Curated annotation (Swiss-Prot):
Tissue: Skeletal muscle, heart, colon, testis, ovary and pancreas.
UniProt organism field: Homo sapiens
Protein name in UniProt: Emerin
Top-level taxon of the source organism: Eukaryota
Subunit note: Interacts with lamins A and C, BANF1, GMCL, BCLAF1 and YTHDC1/YT521. Interacts with TMEM43; the interaction retains emerin in the nuclear inner membrane. Interacts with SUN1 and SUN2. Interacts with ACTB, SPTAN1, F-actin, CTNNB1 and beta-tubulin. Interacts with TMEM201. Interacts with NEMP1.
Lineage of source species: Eukaryota, Metazoa, Chordata, Craniata, Vertebrata
Residues of the full protein shown: 2 to 47 of 254
Annotated compartments: Nucleus inner membrane; Nucleus outer membrane
Role: Stabilizes and promotes the formation of a nuclear actin cortical network. Stimulates actin polymerization in vitro by binding and stabilizing the pointed end of growing filaments. Inhibits beta-catenin activity by preventing its accumulation in the nucleus. Acts by influencing the nuclear accumulation of beta-catenin through a CRM1-dependent export pathway. Links centrosomes to the nuclear envelope via a microtubule association. Required for proper localization of non-farnesylated prelamin-A/C. Together with NEMP1, contributes to nuclear envelope stiffness in germ cells.
LEM domain span: 2-45
Protein modification: Found in four different phosphorylated forms, three of which appear to be associated with the cell cycle.
Length: 47
């Protein structure tokens, strides 16, 4: 439901890679933590 929540696991993984952000397995249990990490980085580029 969150903008980043509509991204699929495969698309989320390629996004972290573009920003060179270390990550492990993506699962609904830790998917949210990953969505927040991309938001914090993308926020910087927006500022």
């Amino acid at each position: 439901h969150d903008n980043y929540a509509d991204l699929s696991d495969t698309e989320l993984t390629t996004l972290l890679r573009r920003y060179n952000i270390p990550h492990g397995p993506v699962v609904g249990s830790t998917r949210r933590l990953y969505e927040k990490k991309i938001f914090e980085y993308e926020t910087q580029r927006r500022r």
